[PDB]
Amino acid sequence: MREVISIHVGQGGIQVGNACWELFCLEHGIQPDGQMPSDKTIGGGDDAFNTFFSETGAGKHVPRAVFLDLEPTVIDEVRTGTYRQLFHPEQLISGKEDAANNFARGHYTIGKEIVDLCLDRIRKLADNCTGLQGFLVFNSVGGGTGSGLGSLLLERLSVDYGKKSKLGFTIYPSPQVSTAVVEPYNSILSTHSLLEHTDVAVMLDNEAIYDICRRNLDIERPTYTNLNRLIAQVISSLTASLRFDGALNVDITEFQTNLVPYPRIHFMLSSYAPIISAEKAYHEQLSVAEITNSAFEPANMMAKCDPRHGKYMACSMMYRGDVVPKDVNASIATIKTKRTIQFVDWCPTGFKVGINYQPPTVVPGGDLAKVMRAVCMISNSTAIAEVFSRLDHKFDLMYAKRAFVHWYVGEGMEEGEFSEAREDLAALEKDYEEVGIETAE
């Protein structure tokens, strides 16, 4: 009735996915094998797990998500891991020789190799599904298939269904921290082929995960376990409406042309809170106002792009748990109140409340403390264009020096893809350039 499905790519990406399905399975508490601890009573009023966990004729409830990546080592760990009763073989599609972070390889070269298997799996699930709203696709501009092969993936999947929503979680090159140097190539080559195949998607950067887990989670020494846990929470709440009763169970498609008013600049930030320790869970109270005012801390901004340097457009503060329409509401007045913040005035307010009544659940072994209320500030501003500009300037020079270009030209891409894709970020620079212009008079 209300389905979504997750797709996983790139090393960090399927790392995220593993964390996620660990999470949801924890949260509905269905045991890793595929059974719930106990029988399910027959009831109505709304869906349940049925969105994602797959009903069998018995205690076998597998996700509705798919793995695809050409670097097949790690995924085997899932193939080995505790959830080897959880998942399902045909759920698993991997490539042996990954891209080597040639975008053009797993996009072009090995792009040709596994696509059809992917699409068949997709047809099996969507055919298995009925009211699948949209598509959860995860990848990374690092684990190279996460850029290339995913690029073809949406490039064709969109042309397959279209009417489904594109739920885009991919990681963005951290501003000064990194993984490689061809990242310019991965990213921008992705981007010009990303945009028109993307509906909307958010940009998760890691350095924020570090700084904030270390200060706010009080973390001393983190890694992808903590990161994947954190994105696990954020996606855990970004879709609760289709999973749990909330006052305004807003929906993705609902989000689509309302958060991203124009068609073009359709990405965003997301600073979840309240992430604190057990020793800050106590020694604190964690007000709605604390999560709320705290929600707009630029230093809390969960992607390393200063909001205060940008002007907000929309903010879908979907809330978990014991939320009051009034209290949050006045907090939103407080958000109108913030002098430092500046909004795409031709969209004076574009707010859209989310009050889901389940407060958050915590993953044992985790660092986040337990609370009563969650916020997701999926918000869109002018600010985020800048780091892009760093990307196209860095890539600008490096590409000017023809660095690495032999690698890509060797695999079947043309140079005008490069300069033209730079025209692509040129245009989007005109977009964040223009939409931020205040309409005259």
Partner 1 sequence: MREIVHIQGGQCGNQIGAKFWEVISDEHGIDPTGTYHGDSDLQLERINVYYNEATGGRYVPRAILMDLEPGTMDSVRAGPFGQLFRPDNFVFGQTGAGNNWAKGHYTEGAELIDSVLDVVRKEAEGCDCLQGFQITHSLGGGTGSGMGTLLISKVREEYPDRIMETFSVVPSPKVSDTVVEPYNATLSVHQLVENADECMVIDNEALYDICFRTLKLTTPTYGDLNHLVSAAMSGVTCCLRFPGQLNSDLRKLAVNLIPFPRLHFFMIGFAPLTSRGSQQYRALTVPELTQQMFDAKNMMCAADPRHGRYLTASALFRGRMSTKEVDEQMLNVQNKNSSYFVEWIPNNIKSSICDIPPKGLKMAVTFVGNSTAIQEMFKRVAEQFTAMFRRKAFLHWYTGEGMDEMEFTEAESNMNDLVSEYQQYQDAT
Task: Assess 367 for contact with partner 1 (CB under 8 A).
Answer: no
How far apart are CB 3 and partner 1 at their closest, in Å?
A: 32
Partner touching 55 among partner 1, Mg ion, its own copies, none, CB below 5 to 8 Å by kind: its own copies
Given 254, 284, 297, 386, the catalytic residue: 254
Task: Assess 98 for contact with partner 1 (CB under 8 A).
Answer: yes
Q: Within positions 140 to 159, which residues make up the interface with partner 1, using CB under 8 A? A: 144
Which residue has its beta carbon closest to Mg ion? 71
Q: Which of 340, 406, 416, 439 binds partner 1 (CB under 8 A)?
A: 406
Nearer to partner 1, 163 or 401 (CB): 401
- Only one residue has tokens 């006052």, namely 247
Nearer to its own copies, 117 or 437 (CB): 117
How far apart are CB 422 and partner 1 at their closest, in Å?
A: 16
How far apart are CB 74 and partner 1 at their closest, in Å?
A: 6
Query: What is the rounded distance in angstroms from the CA atom of residue 424 to the CA atom of residue 28?
Result: 43
Task: Assess 57 for contact with its own copies (CB under 8 A).
Answer: yes
Task: Assess 363 for contact with partner 1 (CB under 8 A).
Answer: no
Nearer to its own copies, 218 or 254 (CB): 218
Task: Assess 282 for contact with its own copies (CB under 8 A).
Answer: yes
Of 56-64, 130-138, 139-147, 336-344, the window that binds Mg ion (rule: CB under 5 A) is 139-147
Task: Assess 71 for contact with Mg ion (CB under 5 A).
Answer: yes
Residue 140 is labelled as binding a ligand: yes
Partner touching 74 among partner 1, Mg ion, its own copies, none, CB below 5 to 8 Å by kind: partner 1
Partner touching 15 among partner 1, Mg ion, its own copies, none, CB below 5 to 8 Å by kind: partner 1
Task: Assess 112 for contact with partner 1 (CB under 8 A).
Answer: no
Residue 206 is labelled as binding a ligand: yes
254 is catalytic: yes
Residue 145 is labelled as binding a ligand: yes
Q: Which of 46, 211, 254, 284 binds its own copies (CB under 8 A)?
A: 284
Partner touching 69 among its own copies, Mg ion, partner 1, none, CB below 5 to 8 Å by kind: Mg ion
Q: How far is CA 230 from CA 148, 172, 174, 295, 431, in A?
A: 25, 16, 16, 16, 31
Q: What would the two tokens of residue 129 be?
A: 């599904």
Q: How far is CA 383 from CA 200, 268, 430, in A?
A: 17, 10, 13
Closest CA to 375 of 279, 297, 260, 306: 297
Q: Where along the sequence are the contacts to its own copies (CB under 8 A)? A: 54-58, 60, 62, 87-91, 127-128, 279-280, 282-285, 287, 289, 293
Residues annotated as part of the active site? 254
Given the rule CB under 5 A, which residues bind Mg ion?
69-71, 98, 143, 145
